[PDB]
Amino acid sequence: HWGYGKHNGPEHWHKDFPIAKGERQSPVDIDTHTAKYDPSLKPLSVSYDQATSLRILNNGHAFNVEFDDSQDKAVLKGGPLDGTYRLIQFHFHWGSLDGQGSEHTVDKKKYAAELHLVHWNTKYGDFGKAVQQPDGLAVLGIFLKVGSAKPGLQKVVDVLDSIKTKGKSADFTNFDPRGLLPESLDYWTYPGSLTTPPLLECVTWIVLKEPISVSSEQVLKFRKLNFNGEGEPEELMVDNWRPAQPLKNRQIKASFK
Ligand SMILES: O=C(O)Cc1cccc([N+](=O)[O-])c1
Ligand SMILES: [Zn+2]
């Protein structure tokens, strides 16, 4: 099934998911010179004080930190959005080396990794219904550069040994995602898609301008994860990023001058 090898990676996905060649696919390259400042954009409202993390899962593609999304406890609002979007999970994409790993690029620059905080529009009731709608999801994307450690990341890094292989989970309560945010909430936004199959065109992307810094040691621990299941040939979970897709008939808008 789909993955990130030679035989099953991004360049193959269209055969099972023809929307891979669609009009609003993600990620994209962000051309900072052509993204226009939109004064009508609002500040983003990230309200994570009541967030309830529950579990961390290796799904064979990344690891997900899952939240209780049965009430409006961690929500994203404002920005480009109408209405309220509940946090369901976050996950990352990363490289085999520090010079690649992000999905979005900035003037063709690849970051070492990219964090995706996935939220669904409460007007649709549940995640599965929301992904069927063009305004169903809001994904907050945050770039990771290698430098100083991110203290708030370390709890995640240190549990990864317990979820080495596909289908492993571990309890992961009381994790505060605020510790993964940069200082500024300046952002770019555009309409796009899930970046893994089924590649549904249901996402308002909000990509923060300011990266977070993580240490080399932190990203090295991401790269010890496995795509494979327990006792299968080990294949390191690295390069689990989809490359930039054609922008087509879209505009990327900036919240900032
Ligand atoms: O790979 C999946 O399981 C599908 C999926 C589910 C939730 C968010 C997603 N995203 O692209 O941000 C993709
Ligand atoms: Zn993602």
Side-chain angles (χ1 to χ4, degrees):
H1 269 276
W2 67 269
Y4 296 94
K6 281 143 159 155
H7 296 284
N8 66 358
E11 79 273 26
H12 296 273
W13 295 351
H14 72 100
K15 291 175 279 170
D16 290 295
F17 303 97
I19 202 177
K21 297 185 177 227
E23 304 299 309
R24 47 176 282 193
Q25 291 289 294
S26 296
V28 299
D29 184 57
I30 300 164
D31 178 344
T32 68
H33 286 108
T34 61
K36 191 182 180 186
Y37 170 58
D38 181 353
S40 72
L41 286 173
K42 315 179 194 204
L44 282 171
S45 171
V46 181
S47 291
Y48 291 167
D49 39 292
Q50 298 296 308
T52 303
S53 70
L54 290 176
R55 195 173 72 137
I56 191 173
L57 175 63
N58 179 335
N59 67 16
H61 309 135
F63 61 87
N64 291 170
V65 175
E66 302 162 351
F67 291 79
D68 172 16
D69 67 338
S70 71
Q71 295 197 80
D72 288 345
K73 288 182 170 187
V75 300
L76 188 67
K77 299 172 76 181
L81 303 173
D82 293 319
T84 293
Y85 295 67
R86 276 208 192 149
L87 180 62
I88 175 168
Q89 50 102 330
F90 70 77
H91 62 273
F92 305 78
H93 307 267
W94 62 90
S96 51
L97 322 146
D98 301 342
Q100 59 190 213
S102 67
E103 295 206 309
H104 295 90
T105 56
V106 178
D107 300 328
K108 301 299 177 74
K109 176 189 176 67
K110 294 172 169 99
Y111 289 85
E114 184 173 335
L115 167 61
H116 289 159
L117 298 124
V118 179
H119 312 75
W120 59 268
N121 194 328
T122 63
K123 76 189 193 158
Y124 302 122
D126 67 70
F127 181 85
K129 285 289 192 292
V131 298
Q132 305 181 56
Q133 313 307 142
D135 61 350
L137 283 185
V139 184
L140 180 60
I142 304 179
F143 296 119
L144 281 59
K145 66 184 185 170
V146 173
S148 303
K150 193 67 164 177
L153 182 59
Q154 189 60 33
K155 283 201 267 179
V156 169
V157 161
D158 273 338
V159 77
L160 297 179
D161 284 325
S162 72
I163 60 152
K164 187 176 174 168
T165 51
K166 178 178 53 173
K168 293 196 154 283
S169 65
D171 290 318
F172 203 68
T173 58
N174 302 104
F175 179 80
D176 184 349
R178 297 178 293 185
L180 298 176
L181 302 176
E183 179 190 321
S184 177
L185 302 175
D186 290 345
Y187 65 87
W188 297 283
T189 184
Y190 74 97
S193 74
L194 308 182
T195 70
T196 49
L199 299 171
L200 294 170
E201 291 181 337
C202 63
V203 181
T204 302
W205 277 96
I206 299 167
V207 177
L208 296 187
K209 172 172 60 46
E210 182 171 21
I212 61 167
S213 282
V214 302
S215 63
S216 189
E217 294 84 347
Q218 287 177 321
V219 175
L220 287 160
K221 287 184 172 165
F222 287 9
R223 299 183 184 128
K224 297 182 136 165
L225 289 163
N226 284 183
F227 292 126
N228 53 279
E230 187 181 5
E232 299 168 8
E234 192 172 12
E235 187 59 8
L236 296 177
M237 184 177 281
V238 296
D239 294 322
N240 63 343
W241 51 276
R242 189 188 191 192
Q245 302 301 305
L247 188 63
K248 301 185 170 167
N249 188 48
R250 301 177 286 180
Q251 293 195 317
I252 303 180
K253 298 176 184 182
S255 73
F256 60 88
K257 317 202 66 150

